[PDB]
Design a protein around this ligand. Structure first.
Ligand SMILES: Nc1ncnc2c1ncn2[C@@H]1O[C@H](COP(=O)(O)OP(=O)(O)OP(=O)(O)O)[C@@H](O)[C@H]1O
Ligand SMILES: Nc1ncnc2c1ncn2[C@@H]1O[C@H](COP(=O)(O)OP(=O)(O)O)[C@@H](O)[C@H]1O
Ligand SMILES: Nc1ncnc2c1ncn2[C@@H]1O[C@H](COP(=O)(O)OP(=O)(O)O)[C@@H](O)[C@H]1O
Ligand SMILES: [Mg+2]
Ligand SMILES: [Mg+2]
Ligand SMILES: [Mg+2]
Ligand SMILES: [Zn+2]
Lengths: 366, 694, 232
DNA sequence: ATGCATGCATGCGCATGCATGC
DNA sequence: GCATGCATGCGCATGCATGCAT
């Protein structure tokens, strides 16, 4: 089943659905959640009357399926000479840490910490398994809280536009059945098929949730279960199944009173349960300062963007190159050196010592 | 085709003779007749199945191995006939016991996964691996059906029951009628039938795609060989030739595929236990064995060991019932690894049920009657408490429960039974189980200034049920934090894809399980040698001084708990009678648990007053280390408060430690300086200045 | 699935633990083509068991008369009530006379007067109150033990519903309703819910419970002695 | 004579309205 | 002042039983 894209939607119209049939080797491709171009014919299948001296429907047959916009050794072999040259040029630059920050967020002024956190979340870690049967998380989740209009929702949209596999939800617009998955019958056999939810479509990707406080308690419990076990279990309609959801969550939230209280802790400012709160790796807090120079700087950028629609951007690397580099880099599984162990131990000791009573109270314990 | 050549009688007889010769003459690498001993072992258990390795068959006769994948049914029938003939030649009585024998292939060249099964594999032999998701149970299917005529009483001859089409008898030979017929239940032969749904392993599924499932059928001895949720490997036949497989009523002409499987792949101990019990440090080894991956928390491990070993229920007549289960409650700050203990206990325990009070638990905590979503049958599903009868029930997030769960737990802990009155069903079910629960404080951090009851959302009657209460705090100790960080980093490094305790040696898990089973089965301690006077005096003094303090007096209940713990200790050493050591240990544990729940001033006063009982089998070095830690903490706090930052070195005079030791009646500290604990905490002693440096 | 014939009907109430001896058979209803979505099963007949046997898991009058004719029956009965618990002789006597109970009397006017006794106990924890309740529940011929808020899967008072499929008035037996002429022990008297608290007033006073819903009005009988425990 | 459309539960998914508890 | 627990209507699909039009 295929769906009409958003770019072709006319005024006040809902996207149309079409049915495609694949034969022989073309059966292998065309996985769910993809954006693909199909080549084939339009053929009528029965679903006025005839007599001796009529209900029909439209079905599409496809011949080839291709990506709309197109194992380290295999990736190296697939890439062309110029693509590999560009990848090598990118790899040998320190400014890659800085330039990418300007590459993905050109219009946004300041907030470099959020950009670096988003980059680290995008790159992700290395998952591991223990000998006792337990599993260790390798994904990174990021939460943002701030005053109104402090560029809070722009990062989620940028991740939407950049990431190829990303699903975005807001508040109560997504139901419980919208997430997780659903099970329905097969139309031509005794088998059953599974309709994937938002989390499953964003598998090995990034899931963006705005207005995280408005979500219902049951939905938050389901999200916490997905974050913790990284598995979705469905026992419905005579079907029992378990599915893998290895996603990374980027969430946006607002204070209870609508403004961040400087004299209160983080727990007293957000109406979020402690379990889901503890699972997040990084929390970012944005406060709108009443500074004249900051207002001038923001105004300059906004007016420059509005004055020059497309000439106010000086990206160093195209988004396609960044996507290719990310795809190449995510395959690597670096190890931990011996001296890094002692360095991490000492740094964690210092971080714990920071929690002493000789300094003012912090908003989040370690 | 291969099947066409196989069908005719000539090659059938030739293959039969060849397989008989192969069965008779096959030997192992050492020359021993494999089939002789295999058939003898099968005979010893009156089995009905035989296992044949494909590698040996290919090595001996290549033609049978070549024809095997492309013609499974007929060749398997021929092999069954040959095996039956050979077995009947070996033993003649089996015509009375078993009239047929099945031949199953064990090994095969590994075949593609469930995704690659396509048209090329039609009517062939395949090997797959998957995970079981459902089971239909055992069902009876017809075989050699005998029919009874409706007009006359003639019994029709047996008809072979094919799995492709239903049996349709032609007509009665005598009366020549062709009307309806009925099945002769008394003389018909029946076979076992089972159906399974198999899904790909989630770990091997590539990202961006969903696992796929297929159906399989088991017959005869293969039934009830796989539990749901287990990982299996099957060798089977990829089949379509069954009636109703083709979609004809509407839609495209689509066939449904079904796999027919024929193979599934998944005294001295007593003396050893008695010898281990003779060891002088068996109890310490058992205590250190629990939770190898969890650092510290020795008291928690000891309490969990006592709970696991358990006690002995009593019932004088049928009036006064006293339980013997030791319930455990842990309350702690976040990040103290409370869930790891529960997971380890679930792994160790033979019958353990794990549940969480937050919600969406796999196993519920309240009984209800409902139609099961999978089996679609009207069932009565009891709570985790009933399913854990004579077992262990672990509860996580104990403070997030609702009213129904709280009421059910209260009635299961007080009355040890659950009463159900729903949908016209009135039942009472036993819930004899040991409860271990984990919880967090109300404010997110434990406050020593308040009592244990005020720091937990639970009510006093619920807390009163638990025999052992543990309190875990997250105080900042640099050495402990450094050691924990080292352990965590080492654990992370070791498990990349590409001995610290005073105990001599922890026991292996299997030996621990055998010890627990033996102790539970064959140990029943008796209290014929108890000393009532000491217990009575201690109880009187405890009550008097608790009321002198004026907060939370002790009661009779604790004494009973103490007795239980004593019995538990007597179960560890396999002693048939309790002695003074177990009584003293139980007294120490109970007093520690009671004291830890009081507030600051009361706890300090009780600890000062009751130093005699709490020091049973303790180490003076540990007490001196505690004193030194208190002094160091005081000095560091003063330095941080005044100077505003920590200094590079910490120093403390020896005279204060000596004076405090004299207060505890200790006059020598050379052993403490030479003790391993002194070096472990990186303390040094300087006689040139009579100081202690850290 | 089980089939009972003739005199074997109504011998078993649902919820009982039974041992049944019978014949393992299959249903015979001629032949029919396989129908429905799934047609993999071929030649499968539903099975059942035909039940043939079910087991459920004057001289004494003189003995009782001799026991009651003694001058020391009161002391013997008092001692027989929980000999394990130390002290509380007056409490044991009160429990015994509660177990024996009084007599109910009707009047020509149609009014009724209660013949059952109700007791209340208050005290500090650790005074062995629950043990007495359990002993009373075991000793009494009919006895129910509750926790005030109902139970794991049964409420304290009855409820009435209407089945949409069959349009019949289904009543769920509560803890008070399940006992008639027996003793109901109630721990944690403080934590009672509002509706149950309101209903127990009428249950104690008139020994009846009146329930009115759409198209129905009923008055169930609850002649229960009440033994309650509570905390300070 | 045979295969199919329909009557009668029942699960599924959902939205909507009334009561209450913090 | 609002989110949630507890009925109840709405719309639907699915399964089991049977009764006869082509
Ligand atoms: N003593 C310890 N030794 C090893 N690892 C530890 C120890 N204490 C804590 N950890 C680690 O702390 C991490 C926190 O997760 P864990 O599930 O154990 O927390 P928890 O105490 O159950 O917390 P919560 O209060 O959130 O339920 C785990 O990965 C665990 O390995
Ligand atoms: N630091 C900033 N730099 C540039 N533009 C900003 C910045 N902060 C806010 N803006 C502008 O203000 C608007 C904020 O809207 P939005 O991000 O939706 O607010 P919120 O996400 O908090 O609801 C954006 O359109 C953005 O262009
Ligand atoms: N007077 C007594 N004689 C014998 N045992 C007692 C006495 N008082 C208390 N106990 C013991 O102490 C325990 C008290 O617990 P419990 O009766 O549940 O307290 P409560 O009912 O007040 O909550 C019982 O198990 C009982 O065996
Ligand atoms: Mg926004
Ligand atoms: Mg936990
Ligand atoms: Mg009690
Ligand atoms: Zn006949």
């Amino acid at each position: 089943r295929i769906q009409e894209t958003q770019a072709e939607l006319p005024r006040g119209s809902i996207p149309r659905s079409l049915e495609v049939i694949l034969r022989a080797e073309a059966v292998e491709s065309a996985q769910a959640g993809d954006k693909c171009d199909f080549t084939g014919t339009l053929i009528v299948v029965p679903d006025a009357r005839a007599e001796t001296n009529l209900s029909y429907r439209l079905v599409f047959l496809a011949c080839c399926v291709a990506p709309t916009n197109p194992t380290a050794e295999s990736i190296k072999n697939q890439m062309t000479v110029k693509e590999w040259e560009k990848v090598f040029e990118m790899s040998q630059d320190k400014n890659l840490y800085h330039n990418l920050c300007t590459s993905l967020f050109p219009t946004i002024h300041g907030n470099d910490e959020v950009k670096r956190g988003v980059l680290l979340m995008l790159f992700g870690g290395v998952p591991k398994t223990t000998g006792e049967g337990t599993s260790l998380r390798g994904d990174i989740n990021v939460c943002i809280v701030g005053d109104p209009s402090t560029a809070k929702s722009q990062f989620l949209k940028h991740v939407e536009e950049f990431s190829p596999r990303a699903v975005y939800t807001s508040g109560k617009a997504s139901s419980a059945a919208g997430l997780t998955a659903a099970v329905v019958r097969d139309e031509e056999s005794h088998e059953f098929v599974i309709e994937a939810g938002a989390l499953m479509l964003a598998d090995n990707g990034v899931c963006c949730i705005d207005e995280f406080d408005k979500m219902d308690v049951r939905d938050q419990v389901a999200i916490h279960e997905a974050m913790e076990q990284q598995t979705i279990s469905i026992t419905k309609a005579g079907v029992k199944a378990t599915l893998n959801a290895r996603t990374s969550i980027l969430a946006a939230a607002n204070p209870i009173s609508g403004h961040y209280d400087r004299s209160k802790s983080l727990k007293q400012n957000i109406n979020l349960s402690a379990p889901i709160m503890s699972r997040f790796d990084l929390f970012f807090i944005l406060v709108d300062e009443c500074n004249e120079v900051t207002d001038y700087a923001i105004a300059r950028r906004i007016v420059d963007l509005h004055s020059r629609i497309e000439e106010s951007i000086d990206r160093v690397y195209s988004l396609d190159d960044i996507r290719r580099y990310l795809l190449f880099a995510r395959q690597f599984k670096p190890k931990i050196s011996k001296e890094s162990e002692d360095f991490i131990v000492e740094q964690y000791k210092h971080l714990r010592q920071r929690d002493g009573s000789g300094v003012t109270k912090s908003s989040w314990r370690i | 085709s291969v099947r066409e050549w196989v069908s005719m009688a000539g090659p059938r007889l030739e293959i039969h003779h060849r397989f008989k010769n192969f069965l008779r003459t096959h030997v192992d690498s050492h020359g021993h007749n494999v089939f002789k001993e295999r058939i003898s072992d099968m005979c010893k258990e009156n089995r009905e199945s035989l296992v044949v390795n494909y590698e040996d068959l290919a090595a001996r006769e290549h033609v049978l191995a070549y024809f095997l994948p492309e013609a499974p049914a007929e060749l398997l029938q021929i092999f069954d006939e040959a095996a039956l003939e050979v077995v009947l030649a070996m033993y003649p009585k089996y015509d009375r016991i078993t009239n047929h024998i099945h031949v199953r292939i064990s090994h095969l060249p590994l075949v593609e996964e469930l995704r690659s099964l396509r048209q090329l594999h039609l009517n062939q032999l395949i090997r797959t691996s998957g995970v079981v998701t459902s089971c239909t149970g055992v069902l009876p299917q017809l075989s050699m059906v005998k029919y009874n005529c409706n007009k006359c009483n003639f019994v029709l001859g047996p008809f072979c029951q094919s799995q492709n089409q239903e049996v349709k008898p032609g007509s009665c030979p005598e009366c020549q009628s062709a009307g309806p017929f009925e099945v002769n239940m008394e003389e018909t032969i029946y076979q076992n039938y089972q159906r399974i749904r198999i899904q790909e392993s989630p770990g091997k599924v590539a990202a961006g795609r969903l696992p796929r499932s297929k159906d399989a059928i088991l017959l005869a001895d293969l039934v009830d060989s796989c539990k749901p949720g287990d990982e299996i490997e099957l060798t089977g036949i990829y089949h379509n030739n069954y009636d109703g497989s083709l979609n004809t009523a509407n839609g495209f002409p689509v066939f449904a595929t079904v796999i027919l499987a024929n193979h599934v792949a998944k005294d001295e101990d007593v003396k050893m236990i008695t010898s281990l019990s003779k060891d002088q440090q068996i109890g310490e080894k058992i205590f250190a064995s629990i939770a190898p991956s969890i650092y510290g928390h020795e008291d928690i491990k000891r309490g969990l060991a006592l709970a696991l070993f358990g006690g002995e229920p009593k019932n004088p007549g049928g009036k006064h019932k006293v339980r013997g289960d030791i319930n455990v409650l842990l309350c702690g700050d976040p990040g103290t690894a409370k869930s790891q203990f529960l997971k380890y206990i679930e792994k160790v325990s033979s019958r353990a049920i794990f549940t969480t009070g937050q919600g969406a638990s796999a196993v519920g905590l309240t009984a209800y009657v409902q139609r099961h979503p999978v089996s679609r049958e009207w069932t009565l599903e009891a709570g985790a408490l009933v399913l854990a009868d004579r077992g262990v029930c672990l509860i996580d997030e104990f403070d997030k429960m609702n009213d129904q769960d709280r009421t059910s737990i209260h009635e299961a802990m007080e009355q040890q039974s659950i009463s159900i009155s729903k949908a016209g069903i009135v039942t009472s079910l036993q819930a004899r189980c040991t409860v271990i629960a984990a919880a967090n404080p109300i404010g997110g951090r434990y406050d020593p200034s308040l009592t244990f009851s005020e720091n937990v959302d639970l009510t006093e009657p619920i807390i009163s049920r638990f025999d052992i209460l543990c309190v875990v705090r997250d105080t900042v100790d640099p050495v402990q934090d450094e050691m924990l960080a080292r352990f965590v980093v080492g654990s992370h490094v070791r498990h990349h894809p590409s001995p610290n305790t005073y105990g001599v040696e922890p026991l292996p898990q299997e030996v621990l399980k055998k010890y627990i089973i033996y102790a539970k089965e064959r140990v029943h301690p008796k209290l014929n040698q108890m000393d009532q006077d000491k217990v009575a005096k201690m109880y009187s003094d405890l009550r008097k001084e608790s009321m002198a303090t004026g907060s939370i007096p002790i009661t009779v209940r604790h004494i009973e708990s103490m007795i239980r713990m004593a019995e538990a200790h007597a179960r560890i050493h396999l002693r048939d009678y309790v002695i003074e050591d177990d009584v003293n240990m139980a007294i120490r544990v109970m007093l520690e648990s009671f004291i830890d729940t009081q507030k600051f001033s009361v706890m300090r006063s009780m600890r000062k007053t009751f130093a005699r009982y709490l020091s049973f089998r303790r180490d003076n070095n540990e007490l001196l280390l505690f004193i030194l830690k208190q002094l160091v903490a005081e000095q560091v706090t003063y330095q941080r408060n005044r100077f505003g930052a920590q200094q590079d070195t910490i120093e403390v005079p020896e005279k204060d430690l000596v004076d405090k030791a004299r207060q505890i009646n200790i006059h020598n500290l050379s052993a403490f300086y030479d003790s391993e604990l002194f070096r472990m905490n990186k303390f040094s002693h300087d006689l040139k200045r009579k100081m202690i440096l850290q | 699935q089980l089939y009972c014939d003739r005199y074997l009907c109504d011998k078993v109430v649902p919820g009982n633990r039974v041992t049944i001896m019978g014949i393992y058979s299959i249903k015979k209803f001629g032949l029919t083509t396989s129908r429905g979505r799934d047609r993999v099963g071929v030649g499968i007949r539903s099975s059942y068991i035909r039940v043939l046997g079910i087991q459920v898991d004057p001289q004494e009058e003189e003995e009782f008369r001799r026991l009651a004719a003694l001058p020391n029956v009161y002391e013997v009965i008092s001692k027989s009530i929980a000999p394990s618990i130390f002290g509380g002789t007056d409490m044991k006597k009160a429990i015994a006379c509660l177990l024996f109970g009084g007599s109910r009397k009707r009047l020509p006017d149609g009014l009724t007067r209660r013949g059952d006794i109700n007791l209340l106990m208050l005290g500090d924890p650790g005074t062995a109150k629950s043990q007495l309740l359990k002993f009373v529940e075991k000793c009494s011929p009919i006895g129910v033990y509750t926790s005030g808020k109902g139970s794991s899967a049964a409420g304290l008072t009855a409820s009435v519903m209407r089945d949409p499929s069959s349009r019949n008035f289904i009543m769920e037996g509560g803890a008070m309703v399940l006992a008639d002429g027996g003793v109901v022990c109630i721990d944690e008297f403080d934590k009672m819910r509002e509706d149950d608290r309101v209903a127990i007033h009428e249950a104690m006073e008139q020994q009846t419970i009146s329930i009115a819903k759409a198209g129905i009005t009923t008055t169930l009988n609850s002649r229960c002695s009440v033994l309650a425990a509570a905390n300070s």
